[PDB]
Subunit: 237 residues, 4 copies
Amino acid sequence: ADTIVAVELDTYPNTDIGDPSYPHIGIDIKSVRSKKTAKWNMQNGKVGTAHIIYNSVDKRLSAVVSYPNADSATVSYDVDLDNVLPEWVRVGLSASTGLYKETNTILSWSFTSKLKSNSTHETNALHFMFNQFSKDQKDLILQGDATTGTDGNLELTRVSSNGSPQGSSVGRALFYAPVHIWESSAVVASFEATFTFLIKSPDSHPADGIAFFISNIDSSIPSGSTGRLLGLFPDAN
Amino acid sequence: ADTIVAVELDTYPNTDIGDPSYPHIGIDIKSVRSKKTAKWNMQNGKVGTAHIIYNSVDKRLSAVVSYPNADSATVSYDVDLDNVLPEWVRVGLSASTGLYKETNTILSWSFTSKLKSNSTHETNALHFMFNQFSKDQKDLILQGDATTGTDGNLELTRVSSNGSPQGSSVGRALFYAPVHIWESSAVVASFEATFTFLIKSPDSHPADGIAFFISNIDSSIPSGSTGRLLGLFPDAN
Amino acid sequence: ADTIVAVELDTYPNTDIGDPSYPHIGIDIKSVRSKKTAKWNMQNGKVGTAHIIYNSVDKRLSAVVSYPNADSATVSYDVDLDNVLPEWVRVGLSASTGLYKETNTILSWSFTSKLKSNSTHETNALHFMFNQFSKDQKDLILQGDATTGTDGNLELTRVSSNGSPQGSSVGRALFYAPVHIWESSAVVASFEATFTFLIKSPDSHPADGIAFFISNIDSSIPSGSTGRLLGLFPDAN
Amino acid sequence: ADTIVAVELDTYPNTDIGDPSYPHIGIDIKSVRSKKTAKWNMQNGKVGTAHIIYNSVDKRLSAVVSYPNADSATVSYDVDLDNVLPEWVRVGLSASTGLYKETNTILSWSFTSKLKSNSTHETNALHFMFNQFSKDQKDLILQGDATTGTDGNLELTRVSSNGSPQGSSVGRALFYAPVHIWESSAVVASFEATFTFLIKSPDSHPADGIAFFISNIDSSIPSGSTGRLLGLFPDAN
Ligand SMILES: [Ca+2]
Ligand SMILES: [Ca+2]
Ligand SMILES: [Ca+2]
Ligand SMILES: [Ca+2]
Ligand SMILES: [Mn+2]
Ligand SMILES: [Mn+2]
Ligand SMILES: [Mn+2]
Ligand SMILES: [Mn+2]
């Protein structure tokens, strides 16, 4: 199977696979069963912002999610990504719905990776920023139900013309260029990602959520990864 | 044929195809016959730096090349790149040798593109920076004789193990992700590129040169584009 | 007197000092009588964005102003800023009102300056970005009526508690650090500025406007520079 | 006294004030007696590079120092800088000599600070980069023996015309603009610094070292802070 590291914004509590009894943010290392979670006071229909940070010196993956006029949620996990991920990866966003549903709308997405070697003035870097998505966005790989250009947004899961989110949907966007997160001369490797999102549901129980993920470069949506598996995992192990 | 916009660092004067009688920097719009040139006091065996800038408001492509402890050469040309290039492009470096030869070594390469729309806080951006090239650089497309990872450099043309440059060589490196240089809501589009290079020849007459270029995304080395055609053009029209 | 280079967003036509008969954007070199102007379809009560760009190779100062869902206005002027400004400057925003009035509210302001020398990998750079202004913003020099921290904005001119703009007001904000825009080894010097603004008036005839400016480091508001003089000039010469 | 947070590159072991028996990198929180140290294989006469990173989510100050062709040294310390430093600070470099001496030459220095609030698209940022220092560098505050512009470098301590380092010297450079490292709406605050340095001594025992530091904005060199106190502390408590 693929190798996945993800930060989940998990809108539906699946307590049978170890979710807490509430919407939560989590850090997923090769499993949907988050290694660490925090309570998330998700706001139906409001624009939120998520920040993800990591560096190879501290080996700590951290994330913060907030809405305007509200307190943040934060989660951290100690993990050496050089022991989990290959040296070249792709980065992306994933989302799903199941019998319960929501919009999984991405309004902006930025990413920076840096690899600093012991050579004098020797940083390698990649940065991208999308504030508007176009109908034919050639620097994104869209998978499953993901589409771009409707109001300049990335719709990770299926939405009707009238704007109703559909059930049993899964979709992903990956940046086209591979990202280098380890090199033998590297003294520090870091990355940061930010995305803004709008999760709206006509229902009291939205599902299933959005994730930022890092994967092997050839990652594809696993078979049957609608609903609680967030487009990331083939099963709940 | 491909569509090419390039800044050439032209080490060998081909006066029969309109080069001036000296090494020169030039701006090439869909032809090896530069629309504008400036005299370039090329230094055999020294590390040089080239800077290329453009924006869609001024519609002027400019370049500056320098060496430490020396005066710069500069060239500019008024051109609307939205009338020359497609809306999605790839960017890259090209170099060639012919019967006369030189190393075409790239020590670093950085690039930034920005597309700002009339949406409040709506920039799209791409930035990359290579200060060290690795043996298997997955975010570069290498064409022809180009190789990476020898002393952390990009060798655009063939060099022996003993470091001797070879004749009749052509090679290109392109960044893997397409670049968006026009969008219908854009109020300003810009890019900048920088590269550092080492051109060394055992001969009094080095050839043929290095170019930074922008192309259709599917660009490949034209047949017979060794020597004076710099890996960019199928003929001298 | 001070030395001033400015891009004006001029909301009130003073045809006696050479304004065109309409709101306009202009480039001001040591005079309120703009060297170049363009018609500006100013929108009372809407958030606008202005972009200013310059580099020392092309020696062209350009600006673009837009609102969402509207066409942009643009103006350019050929000028060698190394012949107008000292090598060290301060950058800032200025605004004024007179007998006619408006809010001169700044919601965000960013600035980047770069000085690249002929030394290998030798850029000097300054970048700042304000998306929220605080009540005691120590990296800004406020002059005249300018205040910060009301709704996280910079109010360049006086506004009552009920939000009514006041007449006969002038105010400026300058970034605290001086900016280096020339050095003897520089091969290219550039800057870019962006700001977002909200000009609102209860009146059919708002005045007087907002400017981005570059000045000698010790610049202060000239005596009597309310109204048409935009906080920048001591007279209309 | 001032409030100081510093990363020390400590070239001389003062075992009486808790240094280990070897050159070391350390994290100093309001004391020269480092809270954490790591062995540093300092290279007399070689150019080194130091990297310092921090963020408010992980509350961990980390540093890495390396030379080309050598293994790095790294040190980390868990500390909430919002409990140590004021909300506005200055950042700088410090160095000293005593009866033992060395050059404390800075070849480049860069710094980035970011404060992200819970407002949609609301980052405040400061970035500067010096690759060449000029004789009259108006965006630096020089203290004590520090000078700029000799070969484009910052000499933190006294060096003769023939290049001999002098004993009993102390000097500091601070960036002119205050830096905002806390705000009540901040969800994440971070900074990174990099500097390149050349420590050369005619002696087998160089002293005393270089530090990157963060201070109250009005910080000055403490009386008697030559030698082991690195220009940072009034005593060895
Ligand atoms: Ca769940
Ligand atoms: Ca030629
Ligand atoms: Ca006017
Ligand atoms: Ca010591
Ligand atoms: Mn979960
Ligand atoms: Mn030519
Ligand atoms: Mn005017
Ligand atoms: Mn120590």
